[PDB]
Design a protein around this ligand. Sequence first.
Ligand SMILES: CN1CNS(=O)(=O)c2ccc(CCc3ccc4c(c3)N(C)CNS4(=O)=O)cc21
Ligand SMILES: N[C@@H](CCC(=O)O)C(=O)O
Ligand SMILES: N[C@@H](CCC(=O)O)C(=O)O
Ligand SMILES: [Cl-]
Ligand SMILES: [Cl-]
Ligand SMILES: [Cl-]
Ligand SMILES: [Cl-]
Lengths: 262, 259
Amino acid sequence: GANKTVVVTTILESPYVMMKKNHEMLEGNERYEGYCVDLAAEIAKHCGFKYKLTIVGDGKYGARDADTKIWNGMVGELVYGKADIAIAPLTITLVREEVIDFSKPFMSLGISIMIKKGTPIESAEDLSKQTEIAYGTLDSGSTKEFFRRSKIAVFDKMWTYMRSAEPSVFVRTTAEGVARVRKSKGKYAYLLESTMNEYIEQRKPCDTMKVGGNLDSKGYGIATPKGSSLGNAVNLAVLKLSEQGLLDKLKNKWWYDKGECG
Amino acid sequence: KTVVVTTILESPYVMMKKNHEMLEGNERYEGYCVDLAAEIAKHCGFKYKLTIVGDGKYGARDADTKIWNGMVGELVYGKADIAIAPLTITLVREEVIDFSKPFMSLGISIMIKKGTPIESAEDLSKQTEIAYGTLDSGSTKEFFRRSKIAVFDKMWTYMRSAEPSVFVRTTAEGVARVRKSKGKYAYLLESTMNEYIEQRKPCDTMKVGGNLDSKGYGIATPKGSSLGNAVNLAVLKLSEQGLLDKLKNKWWYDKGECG
Ligand SMILES: CN1CNS(=O)(=O)c2ccc(CCc3ccc4c(c3)N(C)CNS4(=O)=O)cc21
Ligand SMILES: N[C@@H](CCC(=O)O)C(=O)O
Ligand SMILES: N[C@@H](CCC(=O)O)C(=O)O
Ligand SMILES: [Cl-]
Ligand SMILES: [Cl-]
Ligand SMILES: [Cl-]
Ligand SMILES: [Cl-]
């Protein structure tokens, strides 16, 4: 049939998607800026489709409710046919690949530790062997699922603590985790993806630090519903952009060219 | 039916065992990709036969005949059912074969003999005393041939016409050239292999500078293969169980010989 506008689900997560200065004077895709906004435009141009960016209603990446088995977040938008494609920092995972399709990765990441500068923590093993400093993860994402499912001794011990900690150590948004690090005087550490950690480290007031090596090695992919006709073209577009160096330029544009800490 | 796996002799991915001459079949070989093959086959439930690619090449398309060689060619023309090897995901290959999600990350990197006054690709491009080249018939050479980045295009212009040839047929030949050229040759190769060799005797090479790109290895199948889906889910399963990280530590850090 005739060409229709592709519905893109994404999420407000800096620097992937951010509200522009004066967004209240703008409409449609012009309201937004960031790495994934630029990436959407490049993918759409190579694949030759028009699109509308839509922020996921519940603000979640995507997890499956154990009881109802209903998917939420951006994953749910694809599963239930409310969006045609997700262009966001959406981590490739086994459970998600069982229900949606992912392109080859457009960016690498691993789980990492964010501390307030001066916190006497250097590693996940350090976190697991003490109780003075609390720590947690984002809700409804791949990081929380990583710890829930891990059989590695240190990570299993961390999950056993996190799942029962009171008050809750989990946060609903990355911004809430950053605020908790900054306001807890070194008594909270935040487990998040190295990409977001490195971005925040270069934003004012320059009071956080990434410590230790990454806990795993993964990537973000552009997601489509299973059997989608867009998957093949999107996949080739990602690989083309990668080999031309454009994904590297976009990373430098939105992370380091924008750095505020020197 | 028994799955024919094409792979390539490349340390520490696939290596001949000690006393291999008295062994038979898959037992002749050891390494990261040998272990990975066993894990994939177990999760997907197939029997397999490891076969070293006849021409010893990863895979490139002949510009004139448009015939693919190497492991890529084995898949395209039906001589193998799957490739389990350090085979780089690239656009040109994705147009003719299928790749799993990546099982290992890498980037192009620089290998020097210790003490060579080179710190970056920009350093190499701005001088002529130190020659440099890449492996033939692989993704690294193709990267430089197709690049429009100023530094890498300048490097390609030099490499393509240098005499004697700066390209080598095997990784081992590139390393030997670094070690024997008294600092007058630097070798462009993937960071995974660079880091492995750096920790092998005689401990006389060094990786310098950041990686020039960011990519990964994938398990490859012919287009439309019924094995593609299961293999992909198996890789992701192994990744999340931490088994790919275990395998890396087994074949890289456990084999380090330089302290
Ligand atoms: C950025 N980029 C460009 N496109 S690409 O050539 O396909 C490509 C392949 C691999 C990586 C390395 C990072 C990564 C991403 C994704 C996964 C990983 C590891 N591992 C190691 C486990 N499997 S995965 O799919 O979660 C990056 C990459
Ligand atoms: N990238 C993650 C969200 C962030 C996190 O879980 O740390 C996901 O796709 O679920
Ligand atoms: N991994 C490369 C071979 C090594 C190289 O080109 O440096 C390939 O798949 O072609
Ligand atoms: Cl429309
Ligand atoms: Cl058979
Ligand atoms: Cl022997
Ligand atoms: Cl040949």
